[PDB]
């Protein structure tokens, strides 16, 4: 396995990341109390406790969002997937940044993602589970959205609306993309043979 393309053309990493992002997003929504705790049930993933919503439409929304993220991952068009927490005025208060690098060549010397996927991804999940300790209290009535930072260069004349797998997406406006000099809180970094991923939170200063 010399190359990224050897792992089913990026499909393996995309699938593993989408499975991971779904569980991480649910856990974020729980620990930050974006939704009432009563919709979340306790499950196990990566042999560690996780908290997953049983609300059908919220579930489907998260899945639909990640269904759009998957092809972007496969074509190596993702630098970040960000869970953005918005206050009641719709201003970012907090961002959970999953910064992803998929180099074209596998790093020979790093540990095998696929042999240790449980342990490696569990470590992120465990940091999310207890992150409420290190973050500020969010104001009441927060919502979330998901921002995808792509590898694509912006062109002068580009349509704001971009349809992906039949769902309309939009170029993110400065209200969401910009936080004024946020405080950066590191949670976890991993370098594996196939994937480099860093999780950190940006909080409003």
């Amino acid at each position: 396995t010399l190359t990224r393309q050897d792992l089913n053309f990026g499909q393996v990493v995309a699938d593993v990341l989408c499975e991971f992002l779904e569980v991480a997003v649910h856990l974020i929504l729980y620990v930050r109390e974006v939704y009432p705790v009563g919709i979340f049930q306790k499950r196990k993933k990566y042999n560690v406790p996780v908290q997953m919503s049983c609300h059908p439409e919220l579930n489907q929304y998260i899945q639909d969002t990640l269904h759009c993220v998957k092809p972007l991952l496969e074509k190596n068009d993702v630098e970040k997937v960000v869970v953005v927490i918005l206050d009641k005025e719709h201003r970012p208060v907090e961002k959970f940044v999953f910064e992803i690098t998929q180099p074209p060549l596998l790093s020979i010397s790093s540990d095998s993602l696929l042999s240790h996927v449980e342990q490696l991804l569990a470590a992120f999940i465990l940091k999310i589970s207890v992150c409420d300790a290190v973050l500020d209290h969010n104001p009441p009535g927060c919502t979330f959205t998901v921002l995808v930072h792509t590898r694509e260069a912006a062109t002068r004349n580009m349509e704001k609306i971009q349809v992906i797998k039949d769902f309309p997406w939009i170029l993110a406006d400065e209200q969401d993309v910009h936080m004024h000099d946020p405080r950066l809180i590191p949670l976890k970094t991993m370098t594996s043979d196939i994937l480099k991923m860093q999780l950190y939170v940006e909080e409003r200063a």
């Binding site: 974006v34 939704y35 009432p36 009563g38 919709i39 609300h55 439409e57 919220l58 929304y61 998260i62 969002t65 759009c68 630098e79 953005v84 009535g141 919502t143 979330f144 959205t145 998901v146 921002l147 995808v148 930072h149 792509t150 590898r151 694509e152 260069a153 912006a154 580009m158 609306i161 971009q162 992906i164 769902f167 309309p168 997406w169 939009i170 170029l171 993110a172 969401d176 993309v177």
Partner: peptide, 25 residues
């Protein structure tokens, strides 16, 4: 050079819609 950053046009279900579903059982 700036890259394309995108978000869904539609919001996730509101907290209140979920509260109502929960309270209904």
């Amino acid at each position: 050079d700036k890259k394309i950053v995108i978000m869904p046009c539609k919001c996730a279900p509101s907290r209140q819609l979920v509260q109502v579903w929960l309270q209904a059982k």
